[PDB]
Amino acid sequence: AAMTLASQIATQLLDIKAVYLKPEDPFTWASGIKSPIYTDNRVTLSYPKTRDLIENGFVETIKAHFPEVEVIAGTATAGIPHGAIIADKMTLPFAYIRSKPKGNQIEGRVLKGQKMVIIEDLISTGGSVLDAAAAASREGADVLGVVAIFTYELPKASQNFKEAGIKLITLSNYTELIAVAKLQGYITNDGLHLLKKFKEDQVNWQ
Amino acid sequence: MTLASQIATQLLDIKAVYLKPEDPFTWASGIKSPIYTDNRVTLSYPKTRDLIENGFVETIKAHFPEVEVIAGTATAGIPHGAIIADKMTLPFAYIRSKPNQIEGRVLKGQKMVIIEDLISTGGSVLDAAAAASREGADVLGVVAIFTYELPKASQNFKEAGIKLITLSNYTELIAVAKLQGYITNDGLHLLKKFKEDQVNWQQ
Ligand SMILES: [Cl-]
């Protein structure tokens, strides 16, 4: 009970296998990339204890970073369940933002100038949630920022958010998760070393 | 007012439902419809959303006390189902519209209530229901915000052998529309005829 929120979330993600770490037997991602990590935080939705931790963490970080928020928008599709729960908990309007149109991406009703926080599940490059913010801004939102469950901490995501001028907060992150994984025996020191290389360079980490 | 008429009053007010009997919408099938529904806008009105989500919880708590997972139909049923699951401290999952269609984790034989925002023919949610069943869920039933009360939907559900519960319905909603002046008696008559016959109601 003395762990950071980031570390508590990582503990539970590993425990419920929302995240698997197999640095010495890696996954193949799309695009021919081998990865020591697989993430599916939609699994958290099926574990009320973990889900409550995450949704309560989101509400707390939003109040802290974006107290003037007027609308909670979830990124289609993975960010939607979390966003809806957050909006219910804060007694705020909810909207969601499609990946593409069927004046067409926001579902719900958002007033011009309404202050929005956008909810995302996972940040890799941030491209998806950044495009969501772009669509929201086109349709009249005042986007305060983004909150996500987790980030791979890729330098490219930092660059994307900075260049876009959009604040990102995350509840947990790659560094805390691989740290907790080793502490808890999910990975060996050799595995931890490989995971650190993966953050540095996704192509030549092996 | 009953919960159904309360819901309907708020759907009309926030323009989640548009009634145009004298100038109908056209459906993919070619049917002209006096009604358009977008219940996603309920999500942006906390008073209305609270009423709907609490309504869902009560009816699930009564009709499906053995439910072990709440599943939302992608995409419009997802936000409602997620809030329902949070309120009930239950597992949540959701079901993709097309192909592994269950997202989340559902074990074999886990008892599932499926959440939908609108029943027109019921085809989408029944496709959701078959996919979840193929993947091991024990589908208990479907609950939806609103139904057009189409005979096609009734027969679809009876054939599939699946219970449908709804919070509000076409008949009660067009009654509130007339009472509140959103339609005239002529429009109400047209709306009633559409429900009895979707092909010949303008004749
Ligand atoms: Cl539509």
Swiss-Prot record, chain A:
InterPro entries: OPRT (IPR023031), Or_phspho_trans_dom (IPR004467), PRibTrfase_dom (IPR000836), PRTase-like (IPR029057)
One Pfam short name: Pribosyltran
Domain of life: Bacteria
GO biological process: 'de novo' UMP biosynthetic process; pyrimidine nucleobase biosynthetic process
CDD domains: PRTases_typeI
Record's keyword terms, sorted: Glycosyltransferase, Magnesium, Pyrimidine biosynthesis, Transferase
One Gene Ontology molecular-function label: orotate phosphoribosyltransferase activity
Binding site for 5-phospho-alpha-D-ribose 1-diphosphate: R98, K102, E120, D121, L122, I123, S124, T125, G126, G127, S128
Annotated family: Belongs to the purine/pyrimidine phosphoribosyltransferase family. PyrE subfamily.
The name this protein goes by in its record: Orotate phosphoribosyltransferase
Organism: Streptococcus pyogenes serotype M1
Gene: pyrE
